[PDB]
Amino acid sequence: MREVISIHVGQGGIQVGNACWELFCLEHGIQPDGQMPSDKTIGGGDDAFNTFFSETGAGKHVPRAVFLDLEPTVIDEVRTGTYRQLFHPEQLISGKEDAANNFARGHYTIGKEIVDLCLDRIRKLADNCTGLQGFLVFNSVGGGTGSGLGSLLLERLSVDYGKKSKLGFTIYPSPQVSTAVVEPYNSILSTHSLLEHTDVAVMLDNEAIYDICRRNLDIERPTYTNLNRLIAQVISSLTASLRFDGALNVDITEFQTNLVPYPRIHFMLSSYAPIISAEKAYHEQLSVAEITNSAFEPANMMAKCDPRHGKYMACSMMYRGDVVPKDVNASIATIKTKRTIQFVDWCPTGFKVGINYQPPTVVPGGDLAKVMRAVCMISNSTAIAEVFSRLDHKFDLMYAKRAFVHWYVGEGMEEGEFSEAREDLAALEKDYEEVGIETA
Amino acid sequence: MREIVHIQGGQCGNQIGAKFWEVISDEHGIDPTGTYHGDSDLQLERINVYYNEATGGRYVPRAILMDLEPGTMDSVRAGPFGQLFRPDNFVFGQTGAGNNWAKGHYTEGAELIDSVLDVVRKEAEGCDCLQGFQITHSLGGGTGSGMGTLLISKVREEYPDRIMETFSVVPSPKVSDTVVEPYNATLSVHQLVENADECMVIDNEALYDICFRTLKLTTPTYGDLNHLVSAAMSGVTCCLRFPGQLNSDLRKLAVNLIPFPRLHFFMIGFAPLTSRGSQQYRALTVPELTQQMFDAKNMMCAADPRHGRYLTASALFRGRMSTKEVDEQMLNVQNKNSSYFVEWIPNNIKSSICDIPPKGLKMAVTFVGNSTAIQEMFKRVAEQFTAMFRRKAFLHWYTGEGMDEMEFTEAESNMNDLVSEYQQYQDATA
Ligand SMILES: Nc1nc2c(ncn2[C@@H]2O[C@H](COP(=O)(O)OP(=O)(O)OP(=O)(O)O)[C@@H](O)[C@H]2O)c(=O)[nH]1
Ligand SMILES: Nc1nc2c(ncn2[C@@H]2O[C@H](COP(=O)(O)OP(=O)(O)O)[C@@H](O)[C@H]2O)c(=O)[nH]1
Ligand SMILES: [Mg+2]
């Protein structure tokens, strides 16, 4: 019944998990205890929570989630949070010591012990669900746990599970404003595994989200919480169809059908158009035309790469709330008319459109205006080759110096994997450049 | 989970350790009797990382105090919180090295190493998941330096993968309390480079500088120096004891600051230090903390980094703050002084955040940067050792202990090679 097993790796992943799960509980009005309170007793509004939650049969709805980490700190802060009783304790897996940004350490030494318990919990949650769409996996491809454990988990999911899905939400190392020195190596190896084992990899860069926040929300001092809540809004809009009825319904499986044209090229930017201060929306009309135009402004991309340098290969717009199909068609027409926006020739029809009646909720405490119309665009564009070449350049610097390779080699990782992944990335950017050209 | 075994050896070692345990207790609100007195339950979520539990809820520091001058036992017992440590951990000789490295590394240290090895082994096996040991000592003295490097070699042979971090107090030609400081420092670092995971150097003259310029203290005593180094040391492992937004344990700092295994020397610093006079003037905010903790004066080493170039650097911020602010400050200082940072490293700064500040404080940073200026601070000791070794002064003191001149030759050559390595990776370009 449209079930979606969620996965979360690493500290970033688990913080995003907290965010998205607070958001979901607020959406379905599930009190922190886990008991959905009946409202007006006019009929049980079932079929809604079931996408993400699962009823234990006694009025307790537990989330179909699994949290994975090798450091017991953040997972315990989850345990000592407003949602302590909310999660079935088995799913909040933890390890004694962490990989410490050492992708290899988490990939061979530490992970290969907790991956078994995680796979067990996953098979459990799957045996529960009937008609599962696929798995969402949020992870920081910069950190050791995130990257490494995510690679291992995705490989195990690929081999053990059928064509269901694998949606990946990666917090890529921001191009300009980095946080760790070893980010290049972990990011590159994570990518080399990801491109093989993931269906869809929507990219996310904290730098771009910082810029979006200060530009629109005017929160000059954002924290990771605001970023988390923005990403939560995003993935909510991504699965709104699986829960709320609308004019057109886009199941998660349809992205991997539409957006990704070739098995290797499956990286995608994302954008969320109406993002306005509660006190600023007083001045905005928020027409669907305005939404659609703003969603294509390269500034509002959730990742940081300008598609004006690239080409839009495919786009998926998903609208929520007071949406009318006539205006949506008009807006996509006008956008196709624009010159700043260019589509590849061989893809003439570059749009998957979804329209869901459910207006996006507002979370108390997050600075976002109530709004009746929203969109989220997942776009596979050629400009992501820019960020990939950027990481290639940084990684090439470090590795031509052979800077930190000893750390990884100490973890039984054969150093040949480095050059192998770098050559794979060279081939990938070559693929992007190739498909960027028109036909002969 | 991720336990720590503190190891202090030597007079300066014992003073540093005593002040350190005082500060860590003030951080956990533990009263010198041994019980808890705080108010935030968080203060107990990670309390096992440094203390073991004893019967009656009394928490006992997982410390191991060792020395060769038995008077230091009386010394540590004298100060407050001297009641904390369990006397079983106390290990002491009777003779004392007397500033002699060999005496504390061959003749006498070899006779206490067995006992302290038993003690550290018991403390380790008692703990389940050991992050590693945080040893602290001074290289100027004999017992500290010699016994410290001996036991460090031993424990490294016994626990290779665990972190073996060391706060070493290298003597400076500025203060030059003793005269055999060159031989001690040389014969210490020669093994330090071979066994230590990561090393923070601390120079008394640098601490005096900080206590005279940054702080304006009419009478800086060794107590105040120990206080500063304690504040630093606590700030190092802060993320291990408190949740924060982006965690960073010791191993994370290690991997993020060690390009090559022989370059494991950093220069620490503490951000919000301000004199009681200028305290009300300079407002407390993240850019101020950056400007300070990156001042060439504010470093706890005597090496001016301006001459050098930061290979990598890290910072740990205590207290709730905006991740965008700190990360933007990092990027800013990166793009501001690009000459001061190696080019082949894309982003040489590692940032971390814990949202629990030091008591009575709002925000505070603990900077740890691997530079090449340290190569200068080692050139100092190298030329000092060369001078006082050409004519073979005081050499008989060491040779009578079973040590031979070949040891001095190999030690000074190893230090020279380390210096050349740092020099190359400074001048190297990409
Ligand atoms: N968007 C977002 N990213 C985060 C957040 N917290 C951490 N990150 C990302 O996580 C990276 C830090 O590494 P970690 O997430 O700690 O790596 P890990 O998988 O959690 O485990 P370790 O590698 O052992 O640290 C940084 O690059 C951040 O970009 C968060 O709250 N929100
Ligand atoms: N920073 C600092 N240095 C100290 C302190 N006490 C002693 N020292 C230094 O330690 C050196 C002497 O150490 P010593 O007593 O011989 O240690 P030992 O080798 O274990 O006996 C001197 O150069 C002092 O400068 C202190 O409280 N703080
Ligand atoms: Mg992490």
mmCIF file of N, CA, C and O in Angstrom, chain A residues 216-253:
data_model
loop_
_atom_site.group_PDB
_atom_site.id
_atom_site.type_symbol
_atom_site.label_atom_id
_atom_site.label_comp_id
_atom_site.label_asym_id
_atom_site.label_seq_id
_atom_site.Cartn_x
_atom_site.Cartn_y
_atom_site.Cartn_z
ATOM 1 N N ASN A 216 16.373 34.183 0.654
ATOM 2 C CA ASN A 216 14.918 34.198 0.701
ATOM 3 C C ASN A 216 14.396 34.345 2.123
ATOM 4 O O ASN A 216 13.613 35.253 2.410
ATOM 5 N N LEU A 217 14.816 33.465 3.022
ATOM 6 C CA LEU A 217 14.283 33.482 4.374
ATOM 7 C C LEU A 217 14.902 34.561 5.247
ATOM 8 O O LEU A 217 14.403 34.798 6.351
ATOM 9 N N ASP A 218 15.970 35.211 4.786
ATOM 10 C CA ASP A 218 16.599 36.315 5.506
ATOM 11 C C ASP A 218 17.117 35.889 6.873
ATOM 12 O O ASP A 218 17.360 36.727 7.743
ATOM 13 N N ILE A 219 17.289 34.588 7.088
ATOM 14 C CA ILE A 219 17.918 34.090 8.304
ATOM 15 C C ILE A 219 19.419 34.163 8.066
ATOM 16 O O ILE A 219 20.015 33.273 7.461
ATOM 17 N N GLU A 220 20.031 35.249 8.533
ATOM 18 C CA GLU A 220 21.446 35.474 8.268
ATOM 19 C C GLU A 220 22.329 34.481 9.005
ATOM 20 O O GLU A 220 23.471 34.250 8.595
ATOM 21 N N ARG A 221 21.831 33.881 10.085
ATOM 22 C CA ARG A 221 22.597 32.932 10.887
ATOM 23 C C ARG A 221 21.878 31.592 10.899
ATOM 24 O O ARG A 221 21.374 31.152 11.939
ATOM 25 N N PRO A 222 21.822 30.912 9.764
ATOM 26 C CA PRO A 222 21.162 29.613 9.716
ATOM 27 C C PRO A 222 22.007 28.557 10.403
ATOM 28 O O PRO A 222 23.217 28.698 10.572
ATOM 29 N N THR A 223 21.339 27.497 10.816
ATOM 30 C CA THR A 223 21.995 26.348 11.405
ATOM 31 C C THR A 223 21.694 25.128 10.557
ATOM 32 O O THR A 223 21.028 25.211 9.525
ATOM 33 N N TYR A 224 22.174 23.975 11.008
ATOM 34 C CA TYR A 224 21.809 22.747 10.325
ATOM 35 C C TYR A 224 20.330 22.435 10.456
ATOM 36 O O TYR A 224 19.798 21.689 9.633
ATOM 37 N N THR A 225 19.657 22.983 11.463
ATOM 38 C CA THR A 225 18.237 22.699 11.626
ATOM 39 C C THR A 225 17.429 23.255 10.466
ATOM 40 O O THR A 225 16.543 22.580 9.934
ATOM 41 N N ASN A 226 17.704 24.496 10.073
ATOM 42 C CA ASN A 226 16.955 25.089 8.975
ATOM 43 C C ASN A 226 17.183 24.320 7.685
ATOM 44 O O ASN A 226 16.238 24.053 6.933
ATOM 45 N N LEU A 227 18.432 23.953 7.415
ATOM 46 C CA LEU A 227 18.721 23.135 6.248
ATOM 47 C C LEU A 227 17.952 21.828 6.310
ATOM 48 O O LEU A 227 17.348 21.394 5.320
ATOM 49 N N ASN A 228 17.979 21.180 7.471
ATOM 50 C CA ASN A 228 17.258 19.931 7.635
ATOM 51 C C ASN A 228 15.788 20.108 7.315
ATOM 52 O O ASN A 228 15.195 19.283 6.618
ATOM 53 N N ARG A 229 15.183 21.182 7.806
ATOM 54 C CA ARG A 229 13.753 21.343 7.595
ATOM 55 C C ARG A 229 13.440 21.653 6.144
ATOM 56 O O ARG A 229 12.409 21.211 5.623
ATOM 57 N N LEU A 230 14.323 22.374 5.462
ATOM 58 C CA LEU A 230 14.129 22.586 4.035
ATOM 59 C C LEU A 230 14.163 21.263 3.287
ATOM 60 O O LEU A 230 13.296 20.981 2.449
ATOM 61 N N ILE A 231 15.154 20.429 3.588
ATOM 62 C CA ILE A 231 15.245 19.140 2.914
ATOM 63 C C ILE A 231 14.047 18.270 3.253
ATOM 64 O O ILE A 231 13.576 17.484 2.420
ATOM 65 N N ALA A 232 13.530 18.397 4.471
ATOM 66 C CA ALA A 232 12.332 17.660 4.839
ATOM 67 C C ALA A 232 11.157 18.090 3.982
ATOM 68 O O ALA A 232 10.406 17.253 3.473
ATOM 69 N N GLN A 233 10.972 19.400 3.826
ATOM 70 C CA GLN A 233 9.931 19.891 2.932
ATOM 71 C C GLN A 233 10.099 19.309 1.543
ATOM 72 O O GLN A 233 9.120 18.906 0.901
ATOM 73 N N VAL A 234 11.339 19.251 1.066
ATOM 74 C CA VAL A 234 11.592 18.714 -0.266
ATOM 75 C C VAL A 234 11.096 17.282 -0.361
ATOM 76 O O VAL A 234 10.258 16.952 -1.207
ATOM 77 N N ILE A 235 11.597 16.406 0.510
ATOM 78 C CA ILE A 235 11.239 15.004 0.348
ATOM 79 C C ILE A 235 9.776 14.771 0.675
ATOM 80 O O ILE A 235 9.199 13.776 0.230
ATOM 81 N N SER A 236 9.151 15.667 1.436
ATOM 82 C CA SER A 236 7.709 15.587 1.614
ATOM 83 C C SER A 236 7.007 15.828 0.294
ATOM 84 O O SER A 236 6.175 15.023 -0.141
ATOM 85 N N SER A 237 7.345 16.934 -0.368
ATOM 86 C CA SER A 237 6.774 17.207 -1.679
ATOM 87 C C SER A 237 7.073 16.084 -2.655
ATOM 88 O O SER A 237 6.326 15.879 -3.615
ATOM 89 N N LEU A 238 8.151 15.340 -2.423
ATOM 90 C CA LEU A 238 8.473 14.243 -3.322
ATOM 91 C C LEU A 238 7.522 13.072 -3.150
ATOM 92 O O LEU A 238 7.234 12.365 -4.120
ATOM 93 N N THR A 239 7.029 12.841 -1.936
ATOM 94 C CA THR A 239 6.154 11.710 -1.670
ATOM 95 C C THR A 239 4.740 12.143 -1.326
ATOM 96 O O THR A 239 3.988 11.368 -0.732
ATOM 97 N N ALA A 240 4.365 13.371 -1.673
ATOM 98 C CA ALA A 240 3.011 13.818 -1.382
ATOM 99 C C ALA A 240 1.982 12.988 -2.131
ATOM 100 O O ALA A 240 0.898 12.715 -1.601
ATOM 101 N N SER A 241 2.301 12.571 -3.355
ATOM 102 C CA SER A 241 1.351 11.790 -4.135
ATOM 103 C C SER A 241 1.074 10.449 -3.477
ATOM 104 O O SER A 241 -0.064 9.970 -3.481
ATOM 105 N N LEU A 242 2.101 9.832 -2.896
ATOM 106 C CA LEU A 242 1.919 8.523 -2.290
ATOM 107 C C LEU A 242 0.976 8.559 -1.103
ATOM 108 O O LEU A 242 0.566 7.498 -0.623
ATOM 109 N N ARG A 243 0.628 9.741 -0.614
ATOM 110 C CA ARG A 243 -0.255 9.863 0.533
ATOM 111 C C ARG A 243 -1.530 10.626 0.235
ATOM 112 O O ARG A 243 -2.617 10.154 0.565
ATOM 113 N N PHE A 244 -1.426 11.785 -0.392
ATOM 114 C CA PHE A 244 -2.574 12.639 -0.621
ATOM 115 C C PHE A 244 -2.993 12.572 -2.077
ATOM 116 O O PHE A 244 -2.159 12.489 -2.980
ATOM 117 N N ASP A 245 -4.296 12.613 -2.295
ATOM 118 C CA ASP A 245 -4.853 12.494 -3.628
ATOM 119 C C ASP A 245 -4.806 13.839 -4.326
ATOM 120 O O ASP A 245 -5.006 14.883 -3.702
ATOM 121 N N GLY A 246 -4.543 13.807 -5.627
ATOM 122 C CA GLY A 246 -4.470 15.014 -6.418
ATOM 123 C C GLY A 246 -4.894 14.717 -7.837
ATOM 124 O O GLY A 246 -5.319 13.607 -8.159
ATOM 125 N N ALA A 247 -4.773 15.730 -8.691
ATOM 126 C CA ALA A 247 -5.158 15.565 -10.086
ATOM 127 C C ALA A 247 -4.285 14.525 -10.773
ATOM 128 O O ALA A 247 -4.786 13.645 -11.479
ATOM 129 N N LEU A 248 -2.976 14.612 -10.578
ATOM 130 C CA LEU A 248 -2.044 13.643 -11.129
ATOM 131 C C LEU A 248 -1.168 13.121 -10.009
ATOM 132 O O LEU A 248 -0.717 13.894 -9.159
ATOM 133 N N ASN A 249 -0.933 11.818 -10.003
ATOM 134 C CA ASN A 249 -0.175 11.167 -8.948
ATOM 135 C C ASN A 249 1.127 10.634 -9.517
ATOM 136 O O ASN A 249 1.128 9.945 -10.541
ATOM 137 N N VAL A 250 2.227 10.957 -8.858
ATOM 138 C CA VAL A 250 3.554 10.540 -9.282
ATOM 139 C C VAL A 250 4.126 9.667 -8.178
ATOM 140 O O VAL A 250 4.598 10.167 -7.153
ATOM 141 N N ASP A 251 4.081 8.356 -8.379
ATOM 142 C CA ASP A 251 4.741 7.454 -7.454
ATOM 143 C C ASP A 251 6.248 7.614 -7.571
ATOM 144 O O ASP A 251 6.758 8.109 -8.579
ATOM 145 N N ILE A 252 6.961 7.189 -6.531
ATOM 146 C CA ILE A 252 8.412 7.325 -6.525
ATOM 147 C C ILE A 252 9.040 6.568 -7.684
ATOM 148 O O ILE A 252 10.057 7.000 -8.237
ATOM 149 N N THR A 253 8.440 5.454 -8.092
ATOM 150 C CA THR A 253 9.041 4.653 -9.146
ATOM 151 C C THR A 253 9.059 5.372 -10.484
ATOM 152 O O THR A 253 9.797 4.961 -11.383
#
